[PDB]
C-alpha cells in the first residue's frame, strides 16, 4: 500500500543560458503538482503534444539524474502525465529534450531549465 499527499506548484521553463521564457513553457501545463508518495517526492507535470517528445531527461542543478515515471497517456488529447523524482528544496530542474515533429521534418535536441515558483516544499 501507498499513501500520497499533494499540492499545486507553478513553474516556468526558461531558455538555456538565460532567464527568458522558453517556448517549451507553452508545451507543459500549468501549474504542476508536488506529490509526497510513501515519503518520496515527485513533481507531476503534463506534457502537451506528447507525441512530439521523442526523449526527455531531467536533472537537478548539480547534474544528478531525476527518474521519470509515466502515469497517464491520453491519445485523444495527445498528452502525457509524468512524475519526476525530486527532493524538498529543489528550485530548478535542467531538462534535455529530443523533439520530433516528422511532418515538418523538425528534429532537435535542446537543454532548458525549469524554474519552480518556490522551492519544492516538505509535505505532511
Ligand atoms: C517540448 C518543448 C518543445 C516542443 C514540443 C517544440 C516543438 C516545436 C513545434 C511543433 C510543431 C514548432 C512549430 C516549433 C518551432 C520552433 N521551436 Co520548438 N519545440 C520545443 C522546445 C524548443 C526549445 C527549447 C527551443 C529553443 C529556444 C527556446 O524557446 O527555448 C525551440 C525553438 C524553436 C524555434 C526557433 C526559435 C528560437 O528562439 O530559436 C522554432 C521556429 N523550441 N518547435
Swiss-Prot record:
GO molecular function, a single term: metal ion binding
Subunit structure, as described in the record: Monomer. Interacts with IsdC. Interacts with IsdB.
Domain NEAT: 2-124
Practical uses of the protein: A combined vaccine containing IsdA, IsdB, SdrD and SdrE afforded significant protection in mice against a lethal challenge with S.aureus Newman or any of the clinical isolates NRS252, N315, NRS248, USA100 and USA400. The immune response elicited by the combined vaccine is greater than the one elicited by its individual components.
GO CC, alphabetical: extracellular region
Residue pairs linked by disulfide bridges in the UniProt entry: none
Assigned protein family: Belongs to the IsdA family.
Protein role: Cell wall-anchored surface receptor that participates in the extraction of heme from oxidized methemoglobin/metHb to enable growth on hemoglobin as a sole iron source. Receives heme from IsdB and transfers it to IsdC. Also plays a role in the inhibition of host immune response. Protects S.aureus against the bactericidal protease activity of apolactoferrin. Decreases bacterial cellular hydrophobicity, which renders S.aureus resistant to bactericidal human skin fatty acids as well as to beta-defensins and cathelicidin.
Organism the protein comes from: Staphylococcus aureus (strain N315)
Heme in keyword set: yes
Claim: Cell cycle is one of the keywords in the record: no
Effect caused by changing residue 106 to A: Impaired heme transfer
Transmembrane segments: none
Domain note: The NEAT domain is responsible for binding Fe(3+) and Fe(2+) heme and fibrinogen. The NEAT domain is an inhibitor of apolactoferrin activity, while the C-domain confers resistance to bovine lactoferricin.
Keywords: Cell wall, Heme, Iron, Metal-binding, Peptidoglycan-anchor, Secreted, Signal
Sites where the protein binds heme: 15, 22, 106
Protein name per the record: Iron-regulated surface determinant protein A
Triggers of expression: Repressed by fur in the presence of iron.
Compartment(s): Secreted, Cell wall
Domain of life of the source: Bacteria
Outcome of substituting residue 106 to F: Impaired heme transfer
Amino acid at each position: 500500500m501507498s499513501q500520497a499527499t499533494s499540492q499545486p506548484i507553478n513553474f516556468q521553463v526558461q531558455k538555456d543560458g538565460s532567464s527568458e521564457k522558453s517556448h517549451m513553457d507553452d508545451y507543459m501545463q500549468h501549474p504542476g503538482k508536488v506529490i509526497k508518495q510513501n515519503n518520496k517526492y515527485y513533481f507531476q507535470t503534463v506534457l502537451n503534444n506528447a507525441s512530439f517528445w521523442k526523449e526527455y531527461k531531467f536533472y537537478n542543478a548539480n547534474n544528478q539524474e531525476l527518474a521519470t515515471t509515466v502515469v497517464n497517456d491520453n491519445k485523444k488529447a495527445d498528452t502525457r502525465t509524468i512524475n519526476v523524482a525530486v527532493e524538498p528544496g529543489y528550485k530548478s530542474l535542467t531538462t534535455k529534450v529530443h523533439i520530433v515533429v516528422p511532418q515538418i521534418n523538425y528534429n532537435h535536441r535542446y537543454t532548458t531549465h525549469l524554474e519552480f515558483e518556490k522551492a519544492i516544499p516538505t509535505l505532511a
